[PDB]
Each structure stands twice: as structure tokens, then as C-alpha cells.
Amino acid sequence: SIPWNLERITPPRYYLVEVYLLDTSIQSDHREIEGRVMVTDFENVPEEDGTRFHRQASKCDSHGTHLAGVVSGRDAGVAKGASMRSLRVLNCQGKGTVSGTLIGLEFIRKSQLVQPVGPLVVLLPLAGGYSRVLNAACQRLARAGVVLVTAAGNFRDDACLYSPASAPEVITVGATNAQDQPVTLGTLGTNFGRCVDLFAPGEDIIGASSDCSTCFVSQSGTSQAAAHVAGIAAMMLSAEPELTLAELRQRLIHFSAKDVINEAWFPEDQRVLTPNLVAALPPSTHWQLFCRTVWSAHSGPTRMATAIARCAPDEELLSCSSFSRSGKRRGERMEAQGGKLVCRAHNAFGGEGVYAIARCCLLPQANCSVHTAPPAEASMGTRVHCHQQGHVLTGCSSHWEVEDLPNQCVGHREASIHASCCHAPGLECKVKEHGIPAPQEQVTVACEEGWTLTGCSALPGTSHVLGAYAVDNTCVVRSRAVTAVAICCRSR
């Protein structure tokens, strides 16, 4: 009897916060949201297109009411018992402006300072093209502590091309149907790739119907997927009110359904980038180390091409890796940019381009530093290690300027090695290894239950190795004597 979506986000063992909704007008008197929603005096919408607008037939409150119904709705809502605040940024015709959205996002910041401290989620079930300002406004609100949940987009495209979806300091949500598949919307459907954080139910989603006080309707779209995540964040923040956006994202990622989505629907070039996660509520109130994989945008087939993967300011970059489908790569380095560690990967001369893959973690009181060693050209190879007491190796990195090749990093004799050494309370790190004599496509080693993967690496032996990347807690080494080297860490 329970809707498949609510049933899906619920784990097998199954919970103050204000949810701002920036959308269309809402039916505040609907049974589902009456008492739960407070319609603000705010409204900044563009004039409807007259030539196609008949006010008497137009149900102006269809999008928003359904969404508010997904987040807080009594009978078919995600987080039943969530304070909601409606803002009109879109007209009857579901159209708004970047300028209107900015004023609204300013209004939320104005409310935040005036009202006394408390958790607050912001739901943006809208998309436009990439807007440098709209992203800057979100980045400013996120820094202010607000949890922003945006929809990925219904254009069957790279989410990085649309705003607010592209802003990296906002949770971006894709849409998946009943059979854990990416939602098709007309000839298009859910957006994908690098900018999408996770997916959530987005097809046949039952919520409030503004047609009458008690009627319901099933709607499909990334807005609906974004509403589920908003509800889950509101559910989470209700129990841990001090949670940062970085903190909430890291938990959202962790508690999601891993490897459900039949990736086939996504373009091949996006599959590896697009995360295979489906939103799910954590099973309890609540120490553990959380790590996410941060793929960067393709370097480009250029000669001096470089790819840059970076973490949220609140996060520590424990390891950096690179990947190239062609196999042509010059390695990767852990450098500093704007006073913070960054994962920069260089492209090999004839190469189609490279990918830089960072491993961003939440480590409290961590003193993390990069130990670099130049290649000396020895029978053993290039080595570097954490000399400082209480400083643990969290991950290796290695790059080579050439074209043809115990708490320590070992690389190629021609390559300059880069080790990451962290000092954190009760942090302990072990290295897991796994090899195959003649690879088929990939070799994988994964950290055991309790241990978090901080550093994924390929043993410098095989020339033809496409790259190495961390998938959840599994070190994956794509190889078209390949040994996968995992750096497993934990705190007690």
C-alpha cells in the first residue's frame, strides 16, 4: 500500500529543520501540507506567454504542491514533520529567471540572519543553463551553512551544463524509476556525470494534486528526485542539527543503494563519472571516516592538457589518481592551489586526454601534508615515506615527465613520487593488495567492513594500464601482472 518510492528510500532496518522550496505557487490549504507549509510574501516571476495562456484552465500550483507533498506530505511524504517555506520563483508556465532565483536565494539568507540558528534545507527543483552568478550565490549560501538540494535536469545531458545543478557545493539529484533504472522523460530523461551526487525516485511519484483539497497525482521528473533528497536531508538534520553540507553529502553517499542502476542507459563516456547511488535514509541516529570520489572534467585531447579534481573546503584530499580510456597518460600529482591540496593530472603527448580523480574525506583535527621525492633511477625504484611520528600514509601519487617508461610510496624509476601523510587522532591505515597474472579488463581490491578506502593505486609494473580509481570502498585498476593497491584507513 506504501508508494514504491518511500518504500525504496526506507532501508531494511527502519526518525526543527526548515525546508525552503523555491518553485511555483502552492496549494497551502491541501490536506497533505496544511499546517506544514508557510507561504512567504516573496514572489519574483516573469509574465506568462499570453498567446498560450488561459488563466481559467491553468492549474498554476501543480508543480510546487506536488513537490511540497513529496518533502513533508502527511500520507505520502518523505520527511513527515518538516517545516516548509514556499517561495514563488517560477510562473504558471513553470518559467523563472536567474535574477528572480538570486533575489529568492538572497531572501533565504535574509531570513537565516534574522531567525535564531537552526538547520535549513533549500530545494531548487529548477534548471537553466550554466550560470556563473547562480552558482556563486549557492556557494555563498552553502558557506553560510544552508543545505541546498537541486534537480539534475531532464535533458539526458551532462548536469555540469545547467545551473544550479553544476554548482559543486550543492546536492545534485538524478532520477531513477521503480526498477532502479534512469528515468526517461519524453525522448530525454535524467541528467548524468560528474556533477550529479546521487539519484533518487523520479518516475510515478505520488504526491498532492492541487485539483482538490484531498486528491493525489503521480508525477515524473528530476524535481521529484530532488524532493526525496530534500526530505532525507531534513530527516537527517532533524536528528543531527549541527551537520554541515559536506557532512550531510558524505552520509547521503554512504547510506545510498550502491550498484543498483543499469548504467547502460547513460552514454559510455559518462558511465564511470555518473555515480551508481540511490538515496536512502540512514537506519539510526548514529566515530567513522567518510570518503567520496571526485572525478574531474576531461583534460581535453590538447598537448599541455591538465585535469583538476578538488575537495570541499571542509574536506581533506587523502589521495589523488588518474584515468585515460586510450591508456596514454603522464601520471598525477598532489599539488596546492589557492592554499589547499588539489589532484592535478597531466595528459600524455599523443593522448586523447586524461581524468584526475580525487579522494575527499572528513577527518577532524587532521594535519595532512604532501611528501615529494624526485626519480633517482635505481633498480628498486622511486620511494617516499611519512617520517613524522603519528603521520600516516593515506595515499600515493606518481607522475613522469618522460613519454616511454611500511608507510611508504613506491613508484617508477623514471617517475617523481608524491605521498600524502596525515596526523589524526586514532587514525590507523593498512594496505590491501590484489594481483592477477594476465588481466581481462580490471583487477580489484576492496577494504573490509569497517575500513574506509582512502587510497586506490595500481602497482607500477605494467606499462599498459588505463588508470586506477576508487569506487565506494573498492580500488579498481582498468587494464585493457596487474596488481591493485588499496590504502584502507579507520578512526577509533
Binding site: K95, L102, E106, K110, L126, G128, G129, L161
Partner: protein, 92 residues
């Protein structure tokens, strides 16, 4: 001089309305004055401008309904970081 930014999706552009973003650390007073300077700079050139909003709290900047012919003049303005042309956002 600052930079100009338009939406990449051409049918989603909304020219004639620009978000003038000022440099980080610009006080409301400086934002206010700059918006009034643009109006006068344009006025002298025989142009009508409408300051719709002056951002105070999230971004230092303002909202101007003006001719795109004034963009080069607007770009040379003090404390300007960049100017982004307004564009459409849609229900998802």
C-alpha cells in the same frame, strides 16, 4: 576591465537585463553608488536605465534593465567583477 557572461543555450537567453556582480568586499554604499553612476553614464549618452534591485547580503551587486549597447560602458565601471546577462530557469 571585467568580463561579460551570457547563457550558452541561446533560446534561454534574456537580453536587456544584466546582473552586475561587484568585487568581493564591496559595501552596500559602493554597490548603490556604482548603480547610480551607470544610470548617469548611460543618461548622458541618451539611454534610459532601470535599476530593479541592489543586492545586499549574498552578492555585492545590482540588477539593471538596460540596453546591451551600454555593456562596454558598464564593464569599465569601478568595483565590477563581471556582468552576466539574465536568462531563463524552468520547472524540472
Amino acid at each position: 576591465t571585467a568580463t561579460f557572461h551570457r547563457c550558452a543555450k541561446d533560446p534561454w537567453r534574456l537580453p536587456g537585463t544584466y546582473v552586475v556582480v561587484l568585487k568581493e568586499e564591496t559595501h552596500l554604499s559602493q554597490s548603490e553608488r556604482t548603480a547610480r553612476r551607470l544610470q548617469a553614464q548611460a543618461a548622458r549618452r541618451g539611454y534610459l536605465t532601470k535599476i530593479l534591485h541592489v543586492f545586499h547580503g549574498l552578492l555585492p551587486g545590482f540588477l539593471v534593465k538596460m540596453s546591451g549597447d551600454l555593456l562596454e560602458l558598464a564593464l569599465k565601471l569601478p568595483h565590477v567583477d563581471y556582468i552576466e546577462e539574465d536568462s531563463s530557469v524552468f520547472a524540472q
